[PDB]
Write a protein that binds this ligand. Structure first.
Ligand SMILES: CCCCCCCCCCCCCCCCCCCC(=O)O[C@H](COC(=O)CCCCCCCCCCCCCC)COP(=O)(O)OCCN
Ligand code: SF4
Ligand code: SF4
Ligand SMILES: [Zn+2]
Lengths: 140, 165, 385, 112, 54, 181, 80, 73
């Protein structure tokens, strides 16, 4: 419940009303995404993770609980991501990239040449469970 | 916040208290001994691995070690080595020309690593500045003179370094 | 607005630094660097070299952090070859990388300090630099361009007695760091020259491709040694210092702390250094011993092949990056199956950092431009290639 | 300011050509001053050289090639004006200020 | 051969890497008091010297 | 966020017409796209919540003379948010302008100038597209395979003109090409 | 008397005080050592035979390694 | 003194390597074969070369020019 004094990230101001801001942004997003065709995977992905985050925000009143349950950074970074998603939703309505062309071809390659253990390799660790729920919902 | 802390901040600002410590430890080094080397009477330390002026070597019999295999010419990253070779009058495989452009060379030591008979080496000399560019275009006879001049040190260094290579 | 054309034709400020500044009085309105004065066609030259002959080009890019670029190129080649490096070689590589980081940070900090008028720290630091150059020379026979780190491991094993001398250096280096700090850290003139100068937000740092200290100064916890570890960095304890203000003072403090953490890493490498081979044992990519080549046909043949044609690298392409002292140093290597790189793109952090000079120096005084250049740690060998 | 999209057809490409030619001609007095050409060559000869360069490429029909040629011409003009490399009878790539050719070439060398 | 350069049995002695704290230094009141007392007594002495010169 | 999740999620979420080729390999996840969709793809990857590809590490060209579109432009990108790297590539020829991404990544400015200098590929909407590495008035694009290693001209001081001048090259000892193949 | 104009030679004469003569080469150059610890125990130096026109290249190969701490063998032991 | 040596050697004060190696007498060997390494320490010489001594003429090591002959026959 204690107010945050710093995010520790230069230029990232503290947002003391982060819960209300997040709820408004997520509701705006869930409205504006309906301009995308329902069949498009982008719409389903956005609705999935946006609804999960919105439910977490609605349930939890303390922003520390929101940050903890989400596993996704400070509420300020969650706000940046929500604003960016809204911006992207606007550009995508305007681009109208949807549908599949008639003679659509796409080459997939799953190259399995191994690399040594000692060379630089990114190993972030497992994501929060919602990412995998979103992915499996997209596949199904 | 408090009269004492505000007073202590004001005094420290007015009396330049933190400037005193820099003066003091600058003065401490003033009386300590100096690290300067009295060149050329005194020299810096170097190792048996030091990559200096190339030299061509001979066997103790006087015969040249180089057999014109051209490996050093092939590996040289700077293309600073130029070799010509032919069958010598006694049938030996030997250079007629062995040039190193000291102004192309990057002093990497690859040629010494490539050589299968320890013929070309980078010796320990580093004091060979010249007044002309042409004196830095070493020919075979100059390299052999270098080898004759530095042979004892080169051999000692090779004995030392044979346990690593 | 008037235009001041500043080119310092001397290593006081780089040496090939060339800046066109638009000023409103003493206030900088726009800073435009002109580069290419050290563009030497490195990326074109590399395509004409075997993978071994190309290696010395990497010593000459950020020629203050020689072995780090050697390491990055070796790692890229190892990655494309699927080559396994022995553990002792891994430890030697990391040890030398952290020595290099100390060499770089000493030079950067004290050249910046001399630029803003503090003369003594330069001399003090360059004596320690001389000690570290001696370790370079003892292992490679060169003070600077060692060409010591290679695909498969390192060129030669450590000479007897080197680890003891390195330990002796580490026993006293902390006092040297403390002396540099007491000269600079608390001094009111030093703070007035660096506090709130060249402020960078985390968003700006990401937008302009900043890395290393330039990125960590803005509060972004990001270090490739932890994010994408290589060699034995995951077996080592060290902290990642991050800033809170994103200005020149924070970056200075971060560099000091990075030197302290590098000292820590070196001590750990010295204590954990194992015995064994320093070269990968695959006999198609590494030179045989001198005695083996003089005694065994297979060895002689391999030596001949390796020093004439060089090894082949199967057709592929990848990007490999390391945490160089100046930031993320990357190599985009394209192989076509032959013995020469088809394409070698070098990603230098100084290129991104110097591009950021315009937005960093906006609305600052003329005398702050050199401060901002110093905090960026620009070496034009890597900017221009 | 920014690099424009490729010309959609030959008409707009021709318009860009005319704009480039005007910009090149209007910079002639600056070039005369920078290279000190008052006693070396007339300004009209510079105009004539620019127009001749434009005319030698009059057979091009692809708008993209024309756009690239215009971009290169702009860069060359900028380097000539902003970063002049004075020689004597030469600005950039242009020389400023009874026997057939075979016999002359034969007297010269064996590589024609 | 079989001998390689490395740590001694037990490793090397521990080394400090963190900053050491030197000292606070002269007290503020002490400096204020020394300067103020020197000013007062010295100005009295200036008066005495001026009287003698007169 | 591992390279299996990125490959699968990008297949599920990206508009299909943006990606012609998708490679999953330890050498890096790779997306190939037509030139007309490069900008939108990069904007999507930067802005989307599940990708957050915020850092443009570099742009480089590769010359393939045997191809109708000889140039391949490679975009190396990084997500500090998810600790992941992505490579996005598109092909180009000598006269076809491709979109600049400066408005997406300010760091692209100089990398695009470099591609233009080295290879001759031009970038639409780039605010200041001029050579950045070569000498002023340089002719050609040195990183093209057909450009000779030593170039075409060299410089020397000319005492009669009292200046440094450029002449066609003359090599005392020519570069020796050792063919070990 | 060369000490007055040549301060470089003066420093060698001063630091020769208390030194041990290690050997003399074929050119007459004299080699001295101290066995202390000031420059991390590096206390080897050469007094050139020519008090004027001395030059670093006058050190012969047998003594060059000793002078540069490359080897602990003096010029005499190398020659034997 | 020959044409080969005259291409590089412009000093006649010393003997050329060809004359110097020719002055070394052939090494007598008990046996029909000998291995030459060019140095007492093999790692400091040349790759080992096995030389047959079946011919009456002295056999020459192709790396260091040392000559060998059969001691008895
Ligand atoms: C036998 C030895 C004799 C030695 C004689 C010479 C002494 C050495 C003098 C040289 C010392 C080092 C010089 C280099 C420092 C130059 C930089 C000065 C910067 C400066 O003036 O800062 C101002 C305070 O100092 C000042 O203001 C300086 C003036 C201080 C006058 C004190 C005034 C009140 C004293 C109390 C009197 C009370 C008693 C009488 C009733 C405040 O500016 P800033 O921007 O740096 O702020 C930041 C504060 N951290
Ligand atoms: S030192 Fe390196 S560059 Fe110089 S000649 Fe030897 S191999 Fe070539
Ligand atoms: S110096 Fe060595 S590597 Fe070079 S040609 Fe002679 S024998 Fe071969
Ligand atoms: Zn032999």
């Amino acid at each position: 419940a204690k107010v945050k004094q710093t995010t520790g990230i230069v230029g990232l101001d503290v947002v003391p009303n982060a819960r209300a801001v997040l709820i408004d942004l997520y509701s705006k997003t869930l409205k504006e995404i309906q301009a995308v065709p329902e069949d498009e995977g982008y719409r389903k992905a956005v609705e999935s993770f946006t609804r999960q985050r919105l439910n977490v925000c609605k349930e939890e009143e303390d922003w520390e609980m929101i940050e903890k349950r989400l596993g996704c950074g400070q509420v300020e970074e969650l706000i940046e991501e929500a604003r960016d998603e809204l911006t992207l939703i606007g550009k995508m309505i305007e681009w109208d990239p949807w549908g599949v062309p008639d003679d659509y071809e796409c080459e997939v390659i799953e190259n399995d040449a191994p690399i040594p253990k000692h060379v630089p390799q990114h190993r972030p660790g497992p994501l929060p469970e919602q990412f995998y729920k979103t992915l499996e919902g997209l596949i199904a | 916040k408090d009269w004492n802390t505000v007073f202590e901040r004001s005094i420290n600002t007015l009396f330049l208290t933190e400037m005193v410590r820099g003066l003091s430890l600058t003065l401490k080094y003033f009386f300590d001994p100096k690290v300067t080397i009295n060149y050329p009477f005194e020299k810096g330390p170097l190792s048996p691995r030091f990559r200096g002026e190339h030299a061509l070597r001979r066997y103790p019999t006087g015969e040249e070690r180089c057999i014109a295999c051209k490996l050093c010419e092939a590996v040289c990253p700077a293309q600073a080595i130029t070799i010509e070779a032919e069958e010598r009058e006694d049938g030996s495989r030997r250079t007629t020309r062995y040039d190193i452009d000291m102004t192309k060379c990057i002093y990497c030591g690859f040629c010494q690593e490539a050589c299968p008979v320890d013929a070309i080496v980078e010796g320990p000399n580093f004091e060979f500045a010249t007044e002309t560019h042409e004196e830095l275009l070493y020919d075979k006879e100059k390299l052999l003179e270098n080898g004759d001049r530095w042979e004892t040190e080169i051999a000692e260094n090779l004995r030392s370094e044979s346990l690593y290579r | 607005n008037f235009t001041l054309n500043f080119g310092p034709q001397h290593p006081a400020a780089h040496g090939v630094l060339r800046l066109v500044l638009e000023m409103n009085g003493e206030v900088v309105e726009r800073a435009e660097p002109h580069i290419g004065l050290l563009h030497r066609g490195t990326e074109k030259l590399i395509e004409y070299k075997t993978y071994l002959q190309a290696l010395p080009y990497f010593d000459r890019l950020d020629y203050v952090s020689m072995m780090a670029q050697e390491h990055a190129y070796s790692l890229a080649v190892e990655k494309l070859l699927n080559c396994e490096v022995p553990l002792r070689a891994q430890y030697i590589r990391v040890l030398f990388c952290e020595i290099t980081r100390i060499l770089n940070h000493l030079l950067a900090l004290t050249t910046h300090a001399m630029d803003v008028g503090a003369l003594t720290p330069f001399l003090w630091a360059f004596e320690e630099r001389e000690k570290l150059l001696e370790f370079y020379e003892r292992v490679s026979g060169a003070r600077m361009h060692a060409s010591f780190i290679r695909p498969g491991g390192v060129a030669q094993d450590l000479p007897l007695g080197l680890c003891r001398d390195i330990d002796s250096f580490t026993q006293q280096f902390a006092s040297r760091i403390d002396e540099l700090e007491e000269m600079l850290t608390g001094n009111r003139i030093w703070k007035q020259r660096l506090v709130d100068i060249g402020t960078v937000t985390a968003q700006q740092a990401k937008d302009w491709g900043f890395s290393g200290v330039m990125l960590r100064g803005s509060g972004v916890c990001w270090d490739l040694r932890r994010a994408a570890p290589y060699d034995v960095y995951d077996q080592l304890d060290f902290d990642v210092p991050v800033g809170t203000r994103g200005d020149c003072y924070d970056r200075y403090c971060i560099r000091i702390e990075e030197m302290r953490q590098s000292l820590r890493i070196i001590v750990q490498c010295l204590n954990q250094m194992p015995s064994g081979m320093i070269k990968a044992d695959d006999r198609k990519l590494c030179p045989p011993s001198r005695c083996r080549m003089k005694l065994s046909m297979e060895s002689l043949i391999h030596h001949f092949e390796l020093y004439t044609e060089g090894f082949s690298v199967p057709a592929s392409s990848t990007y490999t990056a390391v945490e160089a002292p100046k930031g993320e140093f990357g190599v985009f290597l394209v192989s076509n199956g032959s013995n020469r790189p088809y394409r070698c793109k070098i990603r230098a952090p100084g290129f991104a950092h110097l591009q950021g000079l315009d937005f960093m120096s906006k609305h600052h005084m003329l005398a702050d431009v050199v401060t901002i250049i110093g905090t960026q740690d620009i070496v034009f060998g890597e900017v221009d290639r | 300011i920014g690099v424009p999209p490729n010309s959609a057809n030959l008409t707009e490409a021709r318009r860009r050509v005319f704009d480039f030619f005007r910009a090149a001609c209007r910079s002639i007095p600056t070039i005369m001053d920078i290279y000190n050409l008052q006693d070396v060559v007339a300004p009209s000869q510079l105009r004539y050289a620019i127009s001749a360069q434009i005319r030698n490429n009059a057979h091009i029909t692809d708008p993209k090639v024309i756009d690239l040629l215009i971009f290169k011409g702009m860069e060359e003009l900028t380097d000539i004006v902003d970063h002049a490399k004075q020689r004597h009878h030469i600005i950039g790539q242009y020389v400023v200020g009874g026997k057939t050719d075979f016999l002359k070439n034969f007297y010269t060398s064996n590589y024609f | 051969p079989l001998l390689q350069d490395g740590p001694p049995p037990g490793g090397f002695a521990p080394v400090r890497y963190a900053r050491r704290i030197s000292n606070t230094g002269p007290s503020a009141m002490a400096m204020f008091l020394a300067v103020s007392g020197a000013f007062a007594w010295g100005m009295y002495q200036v008066g005495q010297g001026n009287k003698i010169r007169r | 966020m591992d390279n299996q999740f990125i490959f699968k999620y990008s297949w599920e979420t990206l508009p299909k017409k943006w990606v012609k080729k998708m490679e999953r390999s330890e050498h890096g996840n790779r997306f190939d796209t037509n030139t007309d969709y490069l900008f939108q793809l990069l904007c999507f990857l930067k802005l989307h919540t599940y990708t957050r590809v915020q850092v443009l590490i570099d742009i480089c060209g590769v010359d393939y003379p045997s191809r109708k579109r000889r140039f391949e432009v490679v975009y190396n990108l990084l997500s500090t948010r998810y600790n992941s790297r992505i490579r996005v590539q598109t092909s180009a020829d000598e006269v076809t302008r491709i979109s600049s991404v400066v408005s997406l990544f300010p760091s692209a400015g100089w990398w695009e100038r470099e591609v233009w200098d080295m290879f001759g590929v031009s970038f639409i909407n780039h605010p200041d597209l001029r050579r950045i590495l070569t000498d002023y008035g340089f002719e050609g694009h040195p990183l093209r395979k057909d450009f000779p290693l030593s170039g075409y001209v060299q410089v020397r001081y000319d005492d009669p003109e009292k200046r440094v001048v450029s002449e066609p090259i003359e090599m005392t000892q020519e570069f020796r090409y050792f063919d070990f193949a | 008397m060369r000490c007055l104009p040549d301060g470089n030679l003066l420093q060698t004469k001063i630091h020769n005080i208390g030194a041990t003569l290690v050997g003399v080469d074929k050119f007459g150059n004299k080699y001295y050592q101290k066995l202390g610890d000031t420059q991390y125990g590096r206390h080897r130096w050469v007094e050139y035979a020519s008090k004027d026109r001395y030059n670093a290249s006058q050190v012969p190969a047998e003594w060059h390694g000793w002078l540069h701490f490359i080897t602990d063998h003096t010029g005499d032991e190398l020659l034997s | 003194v020959g044409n080969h040596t005259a291409k590089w050697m412009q000093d006649r004060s010393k003997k050329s390597p060809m004359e110097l190696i020719s002055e070394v007498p052939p090494i007598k060997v008990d046996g029909r074969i000998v291995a030459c390494e060019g140095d007492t320490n093999p790692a400091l010489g040349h790759p080992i070369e096995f030389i047959c001594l079946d011919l009456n003429e002295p056999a020459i090591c192709k790396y260091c020019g040392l000559r060998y002959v059969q001691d008895h026959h």
